[PDB]
């Protein structure tokens, strides 16, 4: 298939891997920090989803250095993946408009 769809699919699979690894790594980093809430895997996975999407309900967040570094990777993976799907949609439309126009 075309590159842009393959990159999107790949980005999605990769995003999902980062969400899972990120939930797990966040708990490892945050336990040991008094006051931390990002300490059980189920809510950490939810946290990873809210981080990759930038939804920002604000109910959970890292307080340690490594928990924050993990958070940054999840954000960037999420922003990039959704940015890449947009770029893929644009490429699709540009090609179609070319066809609809006789080129």
């Amino acid at each position: 298939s075309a590159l842009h769809w393959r990159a999107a699919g790949a980005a999605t699979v990769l995003l999902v891997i980062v969400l899972l690894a990120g939930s797990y790594l966040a708990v490892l980093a945050e336990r040991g920090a008094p006051g931390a809430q990002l300490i059980t895997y189920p809510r950490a996975l939810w946290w990873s989803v809210e981080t990759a999407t930038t939804v920002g309900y604000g109910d959970l967040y890292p307080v340690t250095l490594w928990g924050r570094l993990v958070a940054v990777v999840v954000m960037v993976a999420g922003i990039t993946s959704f940015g890449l799907v947009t770029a893929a949609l644009a490429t699709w439309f540009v090609g179609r408009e070319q066809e609809r126009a006789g080129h």
């Epitope: 300490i39 059980t40 189920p42």
Partner: antibody, heavy 118, light 106 residues
Amino acid sequence: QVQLQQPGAELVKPGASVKLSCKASGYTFTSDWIHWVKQRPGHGLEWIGEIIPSYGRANYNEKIQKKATLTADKSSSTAFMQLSSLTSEDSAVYYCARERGDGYFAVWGAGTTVTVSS
Amino acid sequence: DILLTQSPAILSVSPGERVSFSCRASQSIGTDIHWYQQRTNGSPRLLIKYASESISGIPSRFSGSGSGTDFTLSINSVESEDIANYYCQQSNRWPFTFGSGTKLEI
């Protein structure tokens, strides 16, 4: 069948150290945490610390004098707690418990009675 | 760290009566409270998780409720085997902590 196996007792001379063990069977995941809880006679349960065997990381009750050091041997599925320089205050039953990373202690060991005496 | 207060320390009830144990947290912890039962010389046994969720193997008589800072563990129709110490434990913030325990007397 018994999920968590602990020795019945350990006698320790004042000033000496002892290594308690907690052998796990049943389902085992890379995400399990093994906790240790202390209970002095007539008293409640006091959380001592925790360890995730798959990684080797340990956390401790910071609020109490640190008497313990946690380690784990992945090949024998055993978690250990090194108690050092003990006094009669350290005499108590020490439980190990398994937590699936979701906050509660699903199953507990029978406990090891530690007596600090000469 | 979160202080879990269990008062009264001893609860006396008559046979077959509904009984309620109280557990109060120093700050809001959602429903991240779990209950354990510990009979004389036995090890703790999980009774209720996340305030009101059932554990397989535990009698229907046991139930839990509450959210925020105030929690309750109830037993419909107390019977002799229920004589024990009851503890609450929170997992909302690190480190996990235990309540001071309530002993049930019939």
